[PDB]
Amino acid sequence: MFVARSIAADHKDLIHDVSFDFHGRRMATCSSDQSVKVWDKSENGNWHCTASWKTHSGSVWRVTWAHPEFGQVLASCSFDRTAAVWEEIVGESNDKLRGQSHWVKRTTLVDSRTSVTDVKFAPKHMGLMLATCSADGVVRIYEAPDVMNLSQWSLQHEISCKLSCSCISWNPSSSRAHSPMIAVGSDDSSPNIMGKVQIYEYNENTRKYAKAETLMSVSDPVHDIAFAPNLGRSFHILAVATKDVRIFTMKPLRKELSSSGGVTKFEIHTVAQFDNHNSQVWRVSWNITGTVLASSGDDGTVRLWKANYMDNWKCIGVLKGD
Amino acid sequence: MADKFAAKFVSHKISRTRWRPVSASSLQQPDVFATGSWDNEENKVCVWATSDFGATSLDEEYQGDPKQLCDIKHPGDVMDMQFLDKERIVTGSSTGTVTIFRHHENNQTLSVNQRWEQAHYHVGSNMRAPCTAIVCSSPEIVSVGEDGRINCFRAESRDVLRTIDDADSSTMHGVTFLRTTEILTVNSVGQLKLWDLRKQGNDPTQIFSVTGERVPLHCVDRHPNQQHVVATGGQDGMLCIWDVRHGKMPMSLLNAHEAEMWEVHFHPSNPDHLFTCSEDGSLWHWDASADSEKPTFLLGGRSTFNISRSSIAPPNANQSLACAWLSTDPTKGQLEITNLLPSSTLSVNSLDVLGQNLVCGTDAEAIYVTRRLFS
Amino acid sequence: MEELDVDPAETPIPGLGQQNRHIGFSWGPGDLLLYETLYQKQGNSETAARCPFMYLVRSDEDIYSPVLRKLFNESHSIFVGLQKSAEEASGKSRKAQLVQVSRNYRSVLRACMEEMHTLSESTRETAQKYISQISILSAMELSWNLCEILFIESAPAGPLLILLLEWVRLHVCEVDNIVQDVLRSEKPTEHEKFWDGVTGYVLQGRMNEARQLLAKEASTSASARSMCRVLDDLLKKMPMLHTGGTQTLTEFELKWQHWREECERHLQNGTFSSNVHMEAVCRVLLGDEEVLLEKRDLMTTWYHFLVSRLLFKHPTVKPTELHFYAQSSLDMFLAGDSCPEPLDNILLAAFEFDIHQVIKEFSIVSSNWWFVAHLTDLLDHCQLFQAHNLYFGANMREFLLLDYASGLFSHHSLWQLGVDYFDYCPNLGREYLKLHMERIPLSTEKKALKALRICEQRQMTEQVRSICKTMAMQSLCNRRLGSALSWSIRAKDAAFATLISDRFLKEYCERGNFTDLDLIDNLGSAMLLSDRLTFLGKYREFHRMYSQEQFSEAASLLLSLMTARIAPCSFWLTLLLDALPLLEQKQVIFSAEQTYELMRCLEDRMAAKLESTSPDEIQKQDSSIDNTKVEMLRLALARNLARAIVTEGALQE
């Protein structure tokens, strides 16, 4: 029996995203009220708002934690066309300012021409990198060259998707046999545009991200995308939130030694398609092992999906808020 | 030997175990001890009684399970614990707090008697730093922490009596009294440091260390009758014996454990015995009493065998009461070494020894108690 | 797997979604964080109610039970003991060992239930939670004991029914409670439940205890005494199978048939027609299904009814026939508006010998992988699983052990047990262990040192580096520069060691002293990890030599640090200022040549300051203090040079 717990988020408007820290002891929430809030889990399992500040001049669409090796770093993105990076200064602020002051805005990334719809830190083995996607159809990848100086972020890569970008996912695979990959989703409502999920692979020879694949079977608007954590699989798994939940496996085809600079070709299979929300699916998230998928939709439910030992995916749980 | 310990599962990890001090004028055995927890959702200090139900049967195996008398919630992990006296328990917290609890025997309750909420913190950030070790010499209390600070308190004083700021640039792991006004500390860079608490400066009086590679030292204890003899344990599981009057190097270095040594204690009333516990899940008894057979001056008997170890000792120190722990003679120092616990516990985080009684606490969420240590 | 056509179990969260608020969620390592969000600002209300609550949904409440914590530690010791012993025993000795291991698991379950029972009597508010946990553990021990009999002991025809009678007796205690209450009465034979106690002992195969109760009735009732003697003789003569007899199943069946014909003859002769209860007991001995069903309330469970039917109709039952009798007993026992419980499906699957269905049903009903992980591990040691890899490259045993071990890693004290479970997972265990080790919340140096020892023992060099880097960053945030440096050196992170070294140099420029002297003095060969750490350690060696009055060696070392260009350009003033006391000594310490090198280093710095200064920052007060320091340096250098030339010129004669 899953126990739902209400948290009085005290946001003045709609909450767009919730992100846990790497240890699952802190969470960040972001809202149309232009604010980010941080919440800490006490030993009794209660949640307490430990920081609340205005971050942006428009609705905050996403919030993400960096890996704890880079310290206590948050990124937020917004309708105001910016992404902001925040660092928590852990220090003795004398016992009178426990309300709001330990999060410092280190930078504002302003290169995007329209709404920045999603923001994701890269896997830690790539360094302190931040991807942003914008409705202008561009993914921008920034790097902080010095973790001690989070005020400086260099634009390393610009990826033209040629579609309005809605969501991004880094492939978390630490395998040196796999070039760094990014999946990009599009919320474009045009029925004439097939392939609203695009996969980009970093090509070492060109020092650029090149389009490896396009999921032509995904013609519906994409609201969220997530690569599953790769704990020793010879293939990738991608979840896609659209009118339904889709799960794709992507097996890299062995590079025939004859294409001296090609992107990796993938053998792609749809291993699951679930219409059980009977409505649009807004979010998809993998467990840390990449074995259980959570999805949320307009049906007001969170659904849990898991493969059995025959690779048959099933709904294993439904959580409903009261 | 496994039949010597009563084991009590308590459903939380035990970081610290200490016996309640008995009166030296009482023939009373210690029957009460305290425990601290760590790595739980709600950490606590507990007081326990060993069961004495009157087995007038010389032939029934001891199955007296320890009984919890009372408990109190502890903010953060109990990083160290000592009795200040029969009624008062002092704790160091992972929050940097030092707390005195009072036990009320009449109603079996604990209460906060006093607290220093910012005993340990990092200078400049005012962020809390763990209080890693504490030592009591009633009414005096000393604490050390990850902030490299030494704090001196008196149990009845609301204010810190003295802080040694920047005493160490590294984490201090352990502290003990050498004398009423002198302490020893151990740290994460493999140093034992001597401090005079009356000295107005922040520099140690002496610094001791091993030669070559330095490993963290986690624990320190002082021989009860021989104030110059000190034992330390470290990250490499090694037992080091020091004479703090004679050089800056250990006198002996003994393989004791296969992992981190958490505690070392001399037996308070029988210091030819020493006890150590480790991350490897072992609890060792060291016996140096084999050389206490008074030299019965009689008779002669030849035989040779060579094994090389280098020690340069100059040949003129008077035969004044050789501490068994400082004996360098490979023909006379037969240390008997006994593992007291059965093979396969998780980490043995703490031990305490009083009279015939030993208690230890483990990461196996268990307390082990014996009342017949030497039987 | 066909995707389960089972609606996902809805977990209602009290108070979440009251007021058309959107739910935000974040996955933790085994917990779901939930919070309310305002996903659509249409309207400038600066008074938008703060999300007042953050909910933590935990999938495994049982992992946090203090009593089940003992279950996990004792079961881990049994598990690791089993894995170490897997190489040593063959044939019949191995089977007896696996039955003993099964009994050790059941003994831990029973001890946990007894402790929960004692705790439930003491504490009214937690009693209901202990009662539900005792019910789950009772269902686990019931089903485990059945699996022990059917799969591990693989009980043949004959011994099978003896073990099923013992199984019912160990799990159905109601008859003993009824008989204890009857026996506490001043007049046991006049007690309402007296014949229920007699009948209940007969249903359980406890003929000797039924006879002891009948002996009381024969003493009290002079009229019933003749019938009691006939019934006592029937119960005494009842053929029982013995686990060491030379008797064949065929010789047993013939004696059993002859005894049954003796019971039937006594019933047909109307021997019991004056006592309805003795007649009912005689009909029970004949296996009369109507009378057995009339006594449903004494058996309480369909599987006790099954074993009673097997005792009185089919005492030589084969394993292959059990499912048919189990199904028929369930259908007859449930023949009203009662649906089968999830436990009934588990027990039926066990009687069908479908181990996969037993595991599947327990994986649906149980919050915790403990039962399925340990039962599957023990049955794999019985060679009952074929080596079929699932479509995901692990076998069923490894899959269940991985998920169970992952469950243990969520808990702050149990993650150490999960390590050893991953070591006995041959295909994926090592990769799971790497992934989970990096996710451990490192709240204390003691916990980090334990995790490091575990990683070092398993040659996990990347995880050792990751843990050390995390501890180095946490120590740096806590302003403990020495601890941060020590952890960075252990990580072998030259870039992070440089960043920490620059902070030590900055703190020295601000305070005039180092905070953590003893660590820098003991760097040894680790000083070579970076040029900046090399500079920091050698610059500390200079201060040590200066404090030891070794002024010539200190001067030569200080000069070497400037000429080797290992000093950062920002720190060159400080180095030159630390040369001032040596330049002003009465004795010439720096030679004329060394003084010219110091003059060159001063001018190289003055040139670099002229190049870095864009014209607009000439006007803040730091420029005058630096100029006075430079004039003092020029004067000290000129005075040392004049003395050095006089002393060197006076030694060349």
Curated annotation (Swiss-Prot), chain A:
Keyword Repeat recorded: yes
Q: What is its main location?
A: nucleus
- Return the InterPro entries for the record: G-protein_beta_WD-40_rep, Sec13/Seh1_fam, WD40/YVTN_repeat-like_dom_sf, WD40_repeat_dom_sf, WD40_rpt
GO (cellular component) term, any one: nuclear pore outer ring
Q: Where in the cell is it found?
A: Chromosome, Centromere, Kinetochore; Nucleus, Nuclear pore complex; Lysosome membrane
Question: Belongs to which family?
Answer: Belongs to the WD repeat SEC13 family.
Name of this chain's protein: Nucleoporin SEH1-A
Q: Which gene encodes it?
A: seh1l-a
UniProtKB/Swiss-Prot annotation, chain C:
Q: Which Pfam families does the UniProt record give?
A: Nucleopor_Nup85 (PF07575)
The residue stretches assigned to a coiled coil in this entry are none
Source species, domain of life? Eukaryota
Q: Which GO terms describe its cellular component?
A: cytosol; nuclear membrane; nuclear pore outer ring
The compartments listed are: Nucleus, Nuclear pore complex; Nucleus membrane
Q: What keywords sit in the KW lines?
A: Membrane, mRNA transport, Nuclear pore complex, Nucleus, Protein transport, Translocation, Transport
A Gene Ontology MF term for this entry? structural constituent of nuclear pore
A GO biological process held by the record: protein import into nucleus
Function comment: Component of the nuclear pore complex (NPC) that seems to be required for NPC assembly and maintenance. Involved in nephrogenesis.
- Oligomeric state and partners? Component of the nuclear pore complex (NPC).
Regarding protein family, the annotation reads: Belongs to the nucleoporin Nup85 family.
This protein's name: Nuclear pore complex protein Nup85
Q: Which gene encodes it?
A: nup85
